[PDB]
Structure of Vesicle-fusing ATPase:
Amino acid sequence: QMGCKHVKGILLYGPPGCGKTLLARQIGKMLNAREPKVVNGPEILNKYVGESEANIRKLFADAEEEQRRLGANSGLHIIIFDEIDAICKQRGSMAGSTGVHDTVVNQLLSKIDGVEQLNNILVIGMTNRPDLIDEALLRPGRLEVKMEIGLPDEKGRLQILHIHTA
Amino acid sequence: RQSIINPDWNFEKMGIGGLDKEFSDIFRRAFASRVFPPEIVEQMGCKHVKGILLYGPPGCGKTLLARQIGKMLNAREPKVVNGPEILNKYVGESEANIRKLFADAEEEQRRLGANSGLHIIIFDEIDAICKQRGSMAGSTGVHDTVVNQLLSKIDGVEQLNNILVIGMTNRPDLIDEALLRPGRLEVKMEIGLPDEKGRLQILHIHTARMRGHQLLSADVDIKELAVETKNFSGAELEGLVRAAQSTAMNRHIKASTKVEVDMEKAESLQVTRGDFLASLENDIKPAFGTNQEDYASYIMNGIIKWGDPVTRVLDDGELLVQQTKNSDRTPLVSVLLEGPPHSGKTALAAKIAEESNFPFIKICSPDKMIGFSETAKCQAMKKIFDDAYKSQLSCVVVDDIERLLDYVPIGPRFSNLVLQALLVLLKKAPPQGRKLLIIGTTSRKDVLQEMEMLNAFSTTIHVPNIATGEQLLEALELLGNFKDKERTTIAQQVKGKKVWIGIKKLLMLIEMSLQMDPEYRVRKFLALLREEGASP
Amino acid sequence: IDAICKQRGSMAGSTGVHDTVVNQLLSKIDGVEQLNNILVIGMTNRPDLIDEALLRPGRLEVKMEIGLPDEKGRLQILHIHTARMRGHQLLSADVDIKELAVETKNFSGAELEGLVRAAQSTAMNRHIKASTKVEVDMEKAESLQVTRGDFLASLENDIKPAFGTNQEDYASYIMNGIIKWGDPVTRVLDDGELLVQQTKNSDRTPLVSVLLEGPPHSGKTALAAKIAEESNFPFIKICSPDKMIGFSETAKCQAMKKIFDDAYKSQLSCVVVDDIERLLDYVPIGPRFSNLVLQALLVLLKKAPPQGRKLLIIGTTSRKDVLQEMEMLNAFSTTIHVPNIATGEQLLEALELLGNFKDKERTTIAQQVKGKKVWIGIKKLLMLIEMSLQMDPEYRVRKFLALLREEGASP
Ligand SMILES: Nc1ncnc2c1ncn2[C@@H]1O[C@H](COP(=O)(O)OP(=O)(O)OP(=O)(O)O)[C@@H](O)[C@H]1O
Ligand SMILES: Nc1ncnc2c1ncn2[C@@H]1O[C@H](COP(=O)(O)OP(=O)(O)OP(=O)(O)O)[C@@H](O)[C@H]1O
Ligand SMILES: Nc1ncnc2c1ncn2[C@@H]1O[C@H](COP(=O)(O)OP(=O)(O)OP(=O)(O)O)[C@@H](O)[C@H]1O
Ligand SMILES: Nc1ncnc2c1ncn2[C@@H]1O[C@H](COP(=O)(O)OP(=O)(O)OP(=O)(O)O)[C@@H](O)[C@H]1O
């Protein structure tokens, strides 16, 4: 009765060792949905023409099929991008990785939000260099919830020490 | 005989606001000849348009328009191409993909002739497969063959009259120049930020359903929200509404052990104006608007009136703002604020810009260009100035010019490229109908005069130091640190002398003096003040 | 034809398919076996890239270049693309085709056809009235007629040439028009007319140059633009420093070379080079500048176009002595001086033609100025007037006079 869509992405950034991968792992296994998909850094690149984009497109197929078949009764699908700064970077700045990186960025942008509408996905990204990411991927309707994980204070250190000596 | 438009199509049903003129132009130029009676159009002996291009900044509603156009026509199911979806690794397999899209249109044209329907094709992110021919030395050779095939298929020896192509891009300057001629993609449109009368429409469109079911409180006024949200794109208004709804819905869910919904209270769910205010404070931050963070960072300790000169500077600033906003014989005006070091001339420029009340305000500072070469500095300046030509009223502040040119008295040495760019950028007028104000600050007027740079600026304003004992006493009183017993002792010594000190240094002197013992502070303050010297 | 046929030394990330195709075409067109009943037609946009072995006589002999038409060709195309309308009495009688042919300069056939199509659509759209439901009238639909206003509106809004328009350029270079505040303006325009005539008529000196010099804020760019506009040549272009922000030496040289190469293609052309001291980066300290651009200018100022073609060049600057020290003042044929305002009568006439400080205020100003000499440029006078107008009605003449005094003088 409100006509509102669901948020479609999260981004986490901060210095090393402060608990970004742990939080994503724990969120992945808190939900009733099926197993999540994990991309371990730049593991989609391929030497042949038009193969990286196919690897990108292959991540969303199940979501599209379930959305078409069921509609508003579908489940939830999760994708996790680890070290996302190694793939998505500002378009038209670098040498384009020989025209490869621009195509990958365009494909990802087209798949996340395009003419065909999805409502059953959640994308999580984690990075150490937040300033190198494309500006068109961090807008509302896309990865729009940005969070910073920093050093803890005395209470946080006490909580961690209680956690690790139980 | 069947009408091309759907029987039940209605403009208000599309759900688009703030783009009335764009849709009117598109409809007139694309669909005017497909609705007129066939015999007269045949007598005119004219052909149909077969192309549309949409460009603009992100989030302003390009894909939405294409989708609504696709669903407005009683035709087939439009084909959709998502980015570089056609490439293939086998030789000659990425061109068959291009050829395959027109195979139905060609067949129907051959069979039914002039009584065929309409076939739509949508290219999303077209600049991924249609860059100029020759650039981008991909050594595969698959990036020119595709462009040639597309060009030869859109308009070639064999003629088609039952197609329509829609393209959408963010970088219109990279498309091939042969694809945009009046025979291939004739209609070109720019989708930009809306104004108040468009923001109101967007907010109404996105709040109609909530209003229908009495889920919106009675103390929320849409007009005030439209006035308050300046230079917001279409996406950000929807994001704001979403954040407000989430804040409203989160009050009935307690989650310390196991997600548990109140359920009872959920009956009386209402969205209040406090949620909207909280969402504007924390969640949504625009890109072409103004942010309180910059003003808070550049005016740290506020502005105190320790004398008359402050008021003079502010009044002159106001006069220049008014001239910029209400004149057509001079669309571009610039001023230079100058004075001795530590006199506080950055905060004053920031205050003037803040009080101007223009929609777009930006500050170009060297704090964000550490280690840059002069080429990168020119690129950053050019980008900041280009972003300001897409607004009806703009203000730009250039801070610490001598740090921008990399100046050092020895030699002397500086950067010529940045100087020339800045000299050429102070006289380029904006597109007709737009206004721009520039405020530059510096502390070395003689150097700028020697560089023939005072002919570019229109006027100069002077920011002075504290020059009398009464002014120093008034500043101390307004700051409120030394009490009457100590203020009398200070006045005994300073009243019979002239002083020469800046506010930014007076604050430092006061905090240095405040660290000694309670009965030793006045002596140290006087010693520091005397040692500072005057040397006017 | 350039998609498949290209030089054999090419893409090295190749599987060997783009060379065997060229060899098979060469061997099939003209090989050991002989044919006498074939004809091959090829179309291309990049003739240079094609293989040289395919262009020798006996394989591809007749090479033809299709270019932009002239006024007569434009008239022919406009007549071809309106015959059907004219035959059925669908075209109004106030439409003058010759005026269109004159106005549409640098257009090609496709752009002219698009102009006609847009004009037709603007007329068809006056009957289709639909804000919430499509519905054609069909009552007035039998009285459809395309008028002159439709053509004018479509020319202003929709269709734009791809070879430069100069409408917006002339809009932005001459922003406040030209006002005859004195005698010097007429002299400058007369000298420009004489130079244009000499370029047009004389055949023994195909190349002519001139330099417009004067103190800053005198209005030297507007006068040059006006002279170029009144020249009425087929080709006119302005080379400005404000379209090369951030460029290096090589990029600037390339841009000027491209502009001059385009100029050499036509039959008689005019070119404007404004702000020479900003084109080559001059700064008094040092001094510093770019030698590459200076050498390019000195070389291009004396190069004659191919026989039977004529070129005029107009350069503007505000520092004559600097150009003299580089020995550039000797590369120009002659010079023209653009002076400032020097007398009270000229200032009063300028105020009269500008339309400000009417009646008694003018009398007060005249009383205060006539007993002195003045030294002010035209461009700064507008700034002073707009600055003075922001005061209250009782403090407008006083502020204007104070600013004028503070301006100073230095003949
Ligand atoms: N907030 C925390 N509470 C408890 N343990 C933590 C916390 N943050 C980090 N750790 C510990 O740190 C380990 C590794 O940290 P983690 O991999 O989450 O960091 P990271 O930010 O991904 O590091 P990197 O930037 O190198 O990828 C975890 O397995 C956990 O033991
Ligand atoms: N004029 C508008 N009226 C109503 N909603 C709008 C408008 N413009 C944008 N929106 C909202 O923005 C959402 C996303 O915008 P959209 O995808 O159309 O932008 P875009 O221009 O394609 O952006 P991108 O540059 O990323 O492609 C739409 O679903 C809609 O909710
Ligand atoms: N009346 C006032 N006018 C200006 N600044 C004031 C006033 N009252 C307090 N201040 C504070 O004084 C400080 C002035 O420092 P600011 O950086 O603006 O000076 P500056 O001359 O630009 O410095 P520098 O010459 O070292 O670059 C700021 O913290 C400002 O908030
Ligand atoms: N009689 C006139 N002659 C020339 N320009 C005039 C005249 N009357 C009004 N103008 C206007 O005055 C302006 C002249 O400024 P212009 O930019 O041509 O000067 P400039 O000498 O190039 O200045 P700068 O030294 O800054 O380069 C134009 O807007 C022009 O339309």
About this structure: Residues A 113, 136, 141; B 16-19, 58-64, 170, 202, 205, 234-235, 238 surround adenosine-5'-triphosphate (ligand 2) (CB under 6 Å).
